[PDB]
Amino acid sequence: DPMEGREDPQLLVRVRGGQLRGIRLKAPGGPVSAFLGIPFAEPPVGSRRFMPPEPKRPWSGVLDATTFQNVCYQYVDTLYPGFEGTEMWNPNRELSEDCLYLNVWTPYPRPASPTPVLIWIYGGGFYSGAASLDVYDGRFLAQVEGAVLVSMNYRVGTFGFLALPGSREAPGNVGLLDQRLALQWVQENIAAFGGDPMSVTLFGESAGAASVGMHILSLPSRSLFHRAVLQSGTPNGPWATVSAGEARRRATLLARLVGCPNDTELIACLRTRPAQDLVDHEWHVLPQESIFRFSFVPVVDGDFLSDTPEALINTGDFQDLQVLVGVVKDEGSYFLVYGVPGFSKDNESLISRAQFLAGVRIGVPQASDLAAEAVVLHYTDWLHPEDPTHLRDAMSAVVGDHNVVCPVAQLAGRLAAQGARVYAYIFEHRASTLTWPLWMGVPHGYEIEFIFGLPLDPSLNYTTEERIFAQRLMKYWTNFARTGDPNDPRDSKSPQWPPYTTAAQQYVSLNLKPLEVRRGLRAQTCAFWNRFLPKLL
């Protein structure tokens, strides 16, 4: 690198694979260091499609690490052309199978002594997502809390989770293996950045939180981190996993659909189809009333997942663990405009009672006739069982409770009974800049920008109370990552966030108001979903 002597000396770093040169980024309160697009794996292309990730082979020279790399090949949403509501979640770099890269944000210059590491695993229903989206920007947590923050790309869709269980050519869960490979990479290499590999906190949202949860339940991953944060997502629940049988069913059907007639011959054929043909058909392998399930998700393979997540969280020893879990207020609203007839982002979506009954069949696709009517009866307001606004909102909560809030509640409760330290929250602030209609309240996903600090960017037109709020949340998260306790010990002025225990079931509300402690995490309704409803299901 004949130009080293004239480049910035504070942006050169050596890792196990070679040298990198990062970039000095401006954050509102000062500069940060950013190292973007570090390969942590051999590009999982050609013969390596569906295969487990192979560790990146060393390079010569200084790797340019100043820009985000490719987004893992995935479906791109087009329901609403040019709409910020969906576009903010869309890929912001070129799609490519060659996408296994990660990013590191640190203070500038890099910390003198070992600094706690947050690793971000993104959501996107396992069919989408990228570590380079504006909403996952590590610069604010780095600049303001002094955090080292790592976020990796992992394979999604067929490429990440298509399995023919028991084969060697497509064992499944490779997308979770991508994540683990990045975790290992952090273990060997994060010290070279000022990162403390003995204090690593995973955090994620939705399918990401599900991924975090799965690393908790998979033993090879348990030595790669110390604390975890699950936001609006769980490894248990109706959507985050499938059986070996079901995964086998779905791969076979997708193979027929793209023209592919012995497991080896089948996978060899799939490997020849262009990436876009897989994406174009991946959705078409479900009854398209299962509009609320994705086809290629982590599989219960007896290997990565030794048994079902519900089994492992019912029988597991968790004294080790500290976990911060939680939900937004209206988890279900978002999805309604994509699956239930009568719903739109553009009108008020007041629905009929028949539309409600129909929506419950689509929301609980696994349900029998009896179970559906039980859900319908439980969520009806008998004082106004025809009121269209109460029915719109009830539809929202059926989808939200069944798929996120009650899975979280179940996980919180089980982890606490089996030794873990648990902190529970409900996030109740609607972003002032939100472009989804008012009726959706605080939708799924829209706490993420507050955890990451985006309101500190004055360019983004948040309120001044939202700046303050984001700083409180950043402190909660980084405090938890540092100590396993979101509270600031140097501060008893502020109200305390008590642990969540099976006796008092306390949890806090996150909004512009001071912390408020509540009891029972939607306790009556989730008893219905987690205890009774699994009979007629």
Ligand X SMILES: Clc1ccc(OCCCCCn2ccnc2)c(Cl)c1
Residues that bind ligand X (CB under 6 A): 75, 77, 89, 123-125, 127, 205-206, 239, 282-283, 291-294, 334-335, 338-339, 399, 403, 444-445
> Is 429 among the residues known to form the active site?
no
| Contacting residues for 3 by C-beta, under 8 A, at least 6 apart | none
Nearer to a second copy, 461 or 502 (CB): 502
Structural tokens at position 218 = 């998979």
117 beta partners: 148, 200
Secondary structure element (H or E) that encloses residue 518, with its range: strand 516-519
Q: In the window 259-288, what residues touch a second copy (CB under 8 A)?
A: none
Cβ at position 325, least distance to ligand X in Å:
16
Nearer Cβ to a second copy (14/384): 384
Structure-token pair, residue 222: 């348990």
Instruction: Give the helix/strand (H/E) hosting 96.
Output: strand 95-96
Q: What does 333 bind: ligand X, a second copy, none (CB cut-off 5 to 8 Å by kind)?
A: none
As measured in angstroms, the least distance from the Cβ of 222 to a second copy is: 31
Of 322 and 410, nearer to a second copy (C-beta) is: 410
Give me the least distance between CB of 394 and a second copy, in Å please: 13
Q: Which does 124 bind (CB under 5 to 8 A by kind): a second copy, ligand X, none?
A: ligand X
Write out the binding residues for a second copy, residues 4-23 only, by CB under 8 A.
none
Cis ω for the linkage preceding 437 (within 30 of 0):
no
Nearest to 124 by CA among 163, 90, 83, 98: 90
Per rule CB under 8 A, is residue 528 in the interface with a second copy? yes
Q: Which is nearer to a second copy, 76 or 377 (CB)?
A: 377
Q: Which has the closest alpha carbon to 363: 338, 388, 380? A: 338
Residue 407 contact partner, candidates a second copy, ligand X, none, CB within 5 to 8 A by sort of partner: none
Indicate which residue of 33, 128, 151, 206 is catalytic. 206
Rank residues 205 and 466 by Cβ distance to ligand X and give the closer one: 205
Q: Which does 293 bind (CB under 5 to 8 A by kind): a second copy, ligand X, none?
A: ligand X
Residues paired with 15 in a beta bridge: 18
State the nearest-atom distance from the C-beta of 399 to ligand X, in Å: 6
63 beta partners: 20
What does the alpha-carbon distance between residue 114 and residue 91 come to, in Å, rounded to a whole number? 33
Q: Please tell me whether residue 3 binds a second copy under the rule CB under 8 A.
A: no
With CB under 5 to 8 Å by kind, the binding choice for 439 among a second copy, ligand X, none is none
418: left (phi > 0), else alpha (psi -120 to 50), else beta?
A: alpha
Whether residue 331 lies in the annotated active site: yes
Q: Measured from the CB atom, is 68 or 283 closer to ligand X?
A: 283
Query: Given candidates 14, 259, 354, 532, which one binds a second copy under the rule CB under 8 A?
Result: 532
Of 23 and 95, CB closest to ligand X: 95
User: For residues 148 and 105, is the Cβ–Cβ distance under 8 A?
Assistant: yes
Residue of 433, 505, 509, 511 that binds a second copy (CB under 8 A): 505
Which of the listed partners (ligand X, a second copy, none) does 460 bind, with a CB threshold of 5 to 8 Å by partner kind? Answer: none
Terminal-residue alpha carbon distance, the chain = 63
- The nearer residue to ligand X, 44 or 445, going by C-beta atoms, is 445
When CB distances are held under 5 to 8 angstroms depending on the partner's kind, the choice from a second copy, ligand X, none that residue 349 binds is: none
Nearer to ligand X (CB atom), residue 87 or residue 169: 87
Helix boundaries (H) for 426-508? 448-451, 464-483
Q: Name the catalytic one among 331, 428, 447, 466.
A: 331
Residue ranges in 353-412 that form contacts with a second copy under rule CB under 8 A: 370, 373-374, 377, 380, 382-383
Q: Which of 88, 244, 397, 527 binds a second copy (CB under 8 A)?
A: 527
CA distance 247 to 302: 13
Q: Pick the catalytic residue: 444, 447, 449, 466?
A: 444
Taking the complex as a whole, the smallest distance from the CB of residue 455 to a second copy amounts, in Å, to 35
Work out whether 523 is an interface residue with a second copy (CB under 8 A). Answer: yes
Is 419 within 8 Å of 304 (Cβ atoms)?
A: no
- Taken as a whole, the chain contains a residue count of 537
Look at strands 227-231 and 195-205 and give their pairing: parallel
CA–CA separation, 106 vs 117, rounded Å?
Answer: 10
Residues 6+ apart with CB under 8 A from 38: 15, 20, 63, 65, 101, 102, 103, 104
For residues 112 and 121, what is the distance between their CA atoms, to the nearest angstrom? 26
Euclidean distance between CA atoms 336 and 444, whole angstroms: 12
Q: Determine which residue in the list 30, 284, 519, 534 makes contact with a second copy, applying CB under 8 A.
A: 519
Residue 159 CA to residue 161 CA, distance in Å, equals 6
Q: Verify whether residue 384 is a known catalytic residue.
A: no
Residue 254 contacts residue 309 (beta carbons within 8 Å): no
CB of 508 to a second copy, least distance (A): 16
Taking the C-alpha atoms of residue 406 and residue 522, their distance in angstroms, rounded to an integer, is 8
Positions annotated as catalytic residues are 206, 331, 444
Residues that bind a second copy (CB under 8 A): 370, 373-374, 377, 380, 382-383, 505, 519-520, 523-524, 527-528, 531-532, 535
